[PDB]
Design an enzyme around this catalytic site. Structure first.
Site, mmCIF file in Angstrom:
data_model
loop_
_atom_site.group_PDB
_atom_site.id
_atom_site.type_symbol
_atom_site.label_atom_id
_atom_site.label_comp_id
_atom_site.label_asym_id
_atom_site.label_seq_id
_atom_site.Cartn_x
_atom_site.Cartn_y
_atom_site.Cartn_z
ATOM 1 N N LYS A 160 1.639 7.772 -10.340
ATOM 2 C CA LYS A 160 2.816 7.474 -9.506
ATOM 3 C C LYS A 160 3.979 6.950 -10.353
ATOM 4 C CE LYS A 160 2.399 3.972 -6.668
ATOM 5 N NZ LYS A 160 1.602 3.269 -5.600
ATOM 6 N N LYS A 172 5.966 4.269 -10.413
ATOM 7 C CA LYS A 172 6.195 2.854 -10.752
ATOM 8 C C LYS A 172 5.072 1.945 -10.258
ATOM 9 C CE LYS A 172 9.837 -0.687 -10.469
ATOM 10 N NZ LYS A 172 11.240 -1.081 -10.133
ATOM 11 N N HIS A 188 -2.302 -5.070 -8.851
ATOM 12 C CA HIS A 188 -1.144 -5.916 -9.155
ATOM 13 C C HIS A 188 -1.332 -7.168 -9.971
ATOM 14 C CE1 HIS A 188 1.443 -3.338 -6.885
ATOM 15 N NE2 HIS A 188 0.592 -3.380 -5.876
ATOM 16 N N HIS A 248 -0.328 -6.605 -0.100
ATOM 17 C CA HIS A 248 0.552 -5.555 -0.609
ATOM 18 C C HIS A 248 1.630 -6.185 -1.465
ATOM 19 C CE1 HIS A 248 -0.875 -1.936 1.328
ATOM 20 N NE2 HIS A 248 -0.935 -2.558 2.489
HETATM 21 N N1 LIG Z 1 9.203 -1.056 3.308
HETATM 22 C C1 LIG Z 1 8.805 -0.296 2.264
HETATM 23 N N2 LIG Z 1 9.170 1.005 2.144
HETATM 24 C C2 LIG Z 1 8.772 1.766 1.103
HETATM 25 N N3 LIG Z 1 7.989 1.298 0.099
HETATM 26 C C3 LIG Z 1 7.560 0.015 0.100
HETATM 27 C C4 LIG Z 1 7.946 -0.879 1.204
HETATM 28 N N4 LIG Z 1 7.383 -2.081 0.959
HETATM 29 C C5 LIG Z 1 6.688 -1.963 -0.210
HETATM 30 N N5 LIG Z 1 6.798 -0.714 -0.715
HETATM 31 C C6 LIG Z 1 6.221 -0.203 -1.975
HETATM 32 O O1 LIG Z 1 4.800 -0.137 -1.969
HETATM 33 C C7 LIG Z 1 4.365 -0.217 -3.338
HETATM 34 C C8 LIG Z 1 3.249 -1.220 -3.482
HETATM 35 O O2 LIG Z 1 2.280 -0.904 -2.509
HETATM 36 P P1 LIG Z 1 0.802 -1.408 -2.821
HETATM 37 O O3 LIG Z 1 0.522 -0.970 -4.233
HETATM 38 O O4 LIG Z 1 -0.034 -0.677 -1.806
HETATM 39 O O5 LIG Z 1 0.804 -2.908 -2.639
HETATM 40 C C9 LIG Z 1 5.514 -0.721 -4.171
HETATM 41 O O6 LIG Z 1 5.964 0.378 -4.956
HETATM 42 C C10 LIG Z 1 6.528 -1.148 -3.129
HETATM 43 O O7 LIG Z 1 7.861 -1.029 -3.614
HETATM 44 N N1 LIG Z 2 5.749 -1.902 3.901
HETATM 45 C C1 LIG Z 2 5.650 -0.591 3.582
HETATM 46 N N2 LIG Z 2 6.298 0.345 4.315
HETATM 47 C C2 LIG Z 2 6.222 1.659 4.023
HETATM 48 N N3 LIG Z 2 5.509 2.147 2.994
HETATM 49 C C3 LIG Z 2 4.812 1.312 2.171
HETATM 50 C C4 LIG Z 2 4.840 -0.137 2.422
HETATM 51 N N4 LIG Z 2 4.069 -0.711 1.470
HETATM 52 C C5 LIG Z 2 3.586 0.286 0.678
HETATM 53 N N5 LIG Z 2 4.030 1.488 1.104
HETATM 54 C C6 LIG Z 2 3.751 2.821 0.518
HETATM 55 O O1 LIG Z 2 2.495 2.872 -0.158
HETATM 56 C C7 LIG Z 2 2.668 3.385 -1.481
HETATM 57 C C8 LIG Z 2 1.749 2.630 -2.424
HETATM 58 O O2 LIG Z 2 0.434 2.675 -1.871
HETATM 59 P P1 LIG Z 2 -0.835 3.065 -2.781
HETATM 60 O O3 LIG Z 2 -0.605 4.515 -3.168
HETATM 61 O O4 LIG Z 2 -2.010 2.848 -1.851
HETATM 62 O O5 LIG Z 2 -0.770 2.071 -3.919
HETATM 63 C C9 LIG Z 2 4.132 3.191 -1.839
HETATM 64 O O6 LIG Z 2 4.631 4.267 -2.642
HETATM 65 C C10 LIG Z 2 4.841 3.106 -0.504
HETATM 66 O O7 LIG Z 2 5.509 4.337 -0.182
#
Ligand SMILES: Nc1ncnc2c1ncn2[C@@H]1O[C@H](COP(=O)(O)O)[C@@H](O)[C@H]1O
Ligand SMILES: Nc1ncnc2c1ncn2[C@@H]1O[C@H](COP(=O)(O)O)[C@@H](O)[C@H]1O
Ligand SMILES: Nc1ncnc2c1ncn2[C@@H]1O[C@H](COP(=O)(O)O)[C@@H](O)[C@H]1O
Ligand SMILES: Nc1ncnc2c1ncn2[C@@H]1O[C@H](COP(=O)(O)O)[C@@H](O)[C@H]1O
Length: 104
Positions: free
Chosen positions: A31, A33, A10, A97
């Site tokens: 992925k 986005k 990020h 995150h």
């Molecule tokens: N409560 C949530 N439900 C689904 N996706 C989430 C949630 N909170 C964050 N994300 C998604 O997780 C992704 C980022 O996760 P990460 O890259 O692991 O920090 C972004 O696409 C967020 O929109």
């Molecule tokens: N707070 C959250 N709640 C549920 N799912 C999440 C959350 N934050 C991240 N994610 C999931 O983790 C994915 C991103 O994680 P990563 O593939 O490790 O970057 C996103 O597409 C979300 O579906």
């Protein structure tokens, strides 16, 4: 998941993120986005200063953001540059995150 991974996922050192390249690497694996923050890491880390237990925090002011958004062609993106506040999960004094743009 942790501060080092958050930075890799990020924080960008260029506003002109090469989405088609970076999004195809293992961390993003094509992925739909991802939002990058165009900033040095120090002011980003500072968002979470003193926050121990996990808590979502919306930044108090705006940062430069570069979004990679997938088109309907598999793993081919468009870049969007903007400024906005953003929300992160803070844990142990670091962003771990990315939650969203403009709101938690
Ligand atoms: N409560 C949530 N439900 C689904 N996706 C989430 C949630 N909170 C964050 N994300 C998604 O997780 C992704 C980022 O996760 P990460 O890259 O692991 O920090 C972004 O696409 C967020 O929109
Ligand atoms: N707070 C959250 N709640 C549920 N799912 C999440 C959350 N934050 C991240 N994610 C999931 O983790 C994915 C991103 O994680 P990563 O593939 O490790 O970057 C996103 O597409 C979300 O579906
Ligand atoms: N991609 C995402 N990024 C951040 N937050 C999300 C995401 N998808 C869902 N949420 C949040 O997760 C909670 C449950 O979402 P939903 O599955 O739409 O009921 C709501 O607070 C949503 O705002
Ligand atoms: N903060 C968020 N970031 C990204 N996507 C979200 C967020 N909150 C909810 N969503 C998703 O966006 C869609 C909203 O659906 P609707 O409320 O019918 O417009 C659902 O798929 C939600 O899971």
């Amino acid at each position: 998941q942790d501060w080092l991974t958050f930075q890799k996922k990020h924080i960008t050192n260029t506003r002109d993120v090469d989405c088609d390249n970076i999004m195809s690497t293992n961390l993003f694996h094509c992925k739909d986005k991802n939002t990058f923050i165009y900033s040095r890491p120090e002011p980003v880390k500072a968002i979470c200063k003193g926050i121990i237990a996990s808590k979502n925090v919306l930044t108090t002011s705006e940062f430069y953001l570069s979004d990679c958004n997938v088109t309907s062609r598999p793993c081919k993106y468009k870049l969007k540059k903007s400024t906005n506040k953003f929300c992160v999960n803070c844990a142990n004094q670091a962003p771990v995150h990315f939650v969203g743009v403009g709101s938690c």
